[PDB]
Design a protein around this motif. Structure first.
Motif, PDB file in Angstrom:
ATOM      1  N   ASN A 102       1.741   4.968  10.374  1.00  0.00           N
ATOM      2  CA  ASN A 102       2.240   3.618  10.350  1.00  0.00           C
ATOM      3  C   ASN A 102       3.633   2.792  10.502  1.00  0.00           C
ATOM      4  O   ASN A 102       4.140   3.727  10.759  1.00  0.00           O
ATOM      5  N   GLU A 137       0.793  -1.721  -0.214  1.00  0.00           N
ATOM      6  CA  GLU A 137       0.109   0.204  -0.070  1.00  0.00           C
ATOM      7  C   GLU A 137       0.999   1.134   0.278  1.00  0.00           C
ATOM      8  O   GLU A 137       2.116   0.900   1.150  1.00  0.00           O
ATOM      9  N   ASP A 186      -1.843  10.307   9.077  1.00  0.00           N
ATOM     10  CA  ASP A 186      -2.094   9.072   9.658  1.00  0.00           C
ATOM     11  C   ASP A 186      -0.180   9.206   9.934  1.00  0.00           C
ATOM     12  O   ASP A 186       0.939   9.512   9.976  1.00  0.00           O
TER      13      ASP A 186
HETATM   14 MG    MG Z   1      -3.600   1.978   7.019  1.00  0.00          MG
END
Ligand code: MG
Ligand code: ADP
Ligand code: MG
Length: 216
Positions: free
Chosen positions: A181, A66, A179
């Motif tokens: 991660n 991703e 975000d």
């Molecule tokens: Mg995610």
């Protein structure tokens, strides 16, 4: 032919996927990263879904991941190493900033050991692209704090040594989206306890970000 991906840090060969929303990362030294993605899928599937880019599959020595920057018009990225370094101490005591969007303009050096004051100043430098809208930049910090707090909590129940892992912080110039991660499982190992070093990295970042979110 091939579009090289604008990496903010690291050493690996990383290119855009053949289709939208994918990056391809070469496993340079071993297939350990692939073995660990598969281990976490099998034993800690909830951790994988919440905190890690989706692994779409494998193409020879390439992982199809991703693209964490995909849905951003103007992404700002910072790579913070929260797992143990190969054989050196952290540049900011509990963690090491590896790079960030525009860091060249701020004369940032990944090899330079930093005071608490200099560490905070580089994180402030990373946030400058978010402009003078205090309210929106505050909401970005709070959303990161929300996710890192849950991560630190969840890490107490995970028997992996997270050697070499990084947090990838991303926010859009307009601060409409952000975000964070966990990436880079290349050096991660199985152990019989939780990783207190990695937990101390995350709780230290939460402290710094909280101070920034509350500071007038
Ligand atoms: Mg995610
Ligand atoms: N899934 C991802 N989406 C977007 N950027 C990524 C992703 N994974 C890695 N990157 C980018 O690549 C850099 C290096 O990633 P990392 O997995 O740490 O590779 P290395 O093993 O070379 O250190 C990061 O700093 C980030 O800029
Ligand atoms: Mg890395």
């Amino acid at each position: 032919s091939i579009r090289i991906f604008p990496r903010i840090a690291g050493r690996s060969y990383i290119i855009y996927g053949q289709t939208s929303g994918i990056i391809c990362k070469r496993m340079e030294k071993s297939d350990n990263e692939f073995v660990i993605y598969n281990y976490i899928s099998e034993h800690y599937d909830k951790f994988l879904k919440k905190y890690v880019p989706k692994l779409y599959g494998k193409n020879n020595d390439m992982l199809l991941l991703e693209d964490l920057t995909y849905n951003y018009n103007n992404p700002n990225v910072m790579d913070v190493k929260i797992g143990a370094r190969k054989r050196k101490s952290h540049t900011s005591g509990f963690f090491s900033i590896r790079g960030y969007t525009n860091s060249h303009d701020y004369k940032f050096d990944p090899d330079e050991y930093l005071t608490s004051e200099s560490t905070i100043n580089h994180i402030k430098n990373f946030m400058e692209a978010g402009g003078e809208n205090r309210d929106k930049t505050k909401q970005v910090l709070l959303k990161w704090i929300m996710k890192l707090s849950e991560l630190a909590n969840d890490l107490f129940e995970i028997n992996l040594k997270f050697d070499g892992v990084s947090l990838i912080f991303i926010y859009d110039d307009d601060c409409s989206k952000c975000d964070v991660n966990v990436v880079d499982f290349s050096r991660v190992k199985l152990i019989d306890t939780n990783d207190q070093m990695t937990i101390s990295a995350v709780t230290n970042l939460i402290k710094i970000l909280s101070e920034l979110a509350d500071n007038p």
